[PDB]
């Protein structure tokens, strides 16, 4: 579903992805209501979306 309204990838993808844990930086005891996403859109996803 993150790859449904926001970003999936190009189908013939070249290059790659690097990810790592970020609990220390992008988290607070009070909560971060700053990173938000999309739940509703009319149509289906296709590669570039912003």
């Amino acid at each position: 579903n993150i790859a449904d309204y926001n970003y999936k990838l190009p189908d013939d993808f070249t290059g790659c992805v690097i990810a790592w844990n970020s609990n220390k930086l992008d988290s607070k005891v009070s909560g971060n209501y700053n990173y938000l996403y999309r739940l509703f859109r009319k149509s289906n996803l296709k590669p570039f979306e912003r």
Partner: antibody, heavy 118, light 109 residues
Framework: VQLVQSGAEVKKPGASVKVSCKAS????????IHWVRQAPGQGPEWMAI????????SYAQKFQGRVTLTRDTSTSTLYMELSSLRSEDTAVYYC??????????????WGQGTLVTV | SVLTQPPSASGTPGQRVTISCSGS????????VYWYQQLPGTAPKLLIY???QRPSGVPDRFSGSRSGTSASLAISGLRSEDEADYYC?????????????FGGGTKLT
């Protein structure tokens, strides 16, 4: 520059028990507050971490939702209202101090604790 | 995870023994450890930071170190006053909960 607890006694199981300790000393808005529970004859379990000011709260897996905490700045009181007491909920509570704006690091000295039994 | 600890730590006055906490992956090898000593009848007191320096000041007869997924504390010059219970605390970061987990329980004799 110290924290002292409040007095309590044995209560009926399946009820609400009010627990509190004061806070005084340095500035208040930039020091996180830890509470931790310790059972006799065993190891202590971490209870909660609280940000003053906005009163941010976070709870562990074994106590998520079944315990309620409140906090304030001017009166400087720190309340929990325990509910659903078992024989497992007979232990001593401690209120602490942290580094400040960070929940990782060494723990500043605790109080004298509050003993609760059912 | 669970932070297994030996049930007791044998000792005699005037010698050196090591007390250790053995943990799982991403609990000891990831974050630092904290050693604690509980004197009877008193509130617990901090004794070490991350095991490279002393917090305020203690004689250097106690030495802490890490090895892989475990942490160890070597104590020497044992006295009858220091007979207490030792605990270790660490940030767990496990599945469904990431609290400040503690060890088991040991007794110094």
């Amino acid at each position: 520059v110290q924290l002292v607890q409040s007095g309590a006694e044995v209560k009926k199981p399946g009820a609400s028990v009010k627990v509190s300790c004061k806070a005084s000393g340095y500035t208040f808005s930039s020091y996180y507050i830890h509470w931790v529970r310790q059972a006799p004859g065993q190891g202590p379990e971490w209870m909660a971490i609280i940000n003053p000011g906005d009163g941010g709260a976070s709870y562990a897996q074994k106590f998520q939702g079944r315990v309620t905490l409140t906090r304030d700045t001017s009166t400087s009181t720190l309340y929990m209202e325990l509910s659903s007491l078992r024989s497992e909920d007979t232990a001593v509570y401690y209120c602490a101090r942290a580094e400040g704006s960070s929940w990782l690091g060494w723990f500043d000295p605790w109080g004298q604790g509050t003993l609760v039994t059912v | 995870s669970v932070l297994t600890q030996p049930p007791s730590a044998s000792g005699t006055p005037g010698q050196r023994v090591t007390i250790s906490c053995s943990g799982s992956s991403s609990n000891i090898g990831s974050n630092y450890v904290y050693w604690y000593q509980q004197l009877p009848g008193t509130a617990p007191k901090l004794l070490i930071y991350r095991n490279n320096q002393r917090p305020s000041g203690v004689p250097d007869r106690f030495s802490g170190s890490r090895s892989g997924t475990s942490a160890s504390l070597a104590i020497s010059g044992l006295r009858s006053e220091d007979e207490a219970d030792y605990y270790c605390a660490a940030w767990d970061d496990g599945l469904s909960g990431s609290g400040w987990v503690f060890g088991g329980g040991t007794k110094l004799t």
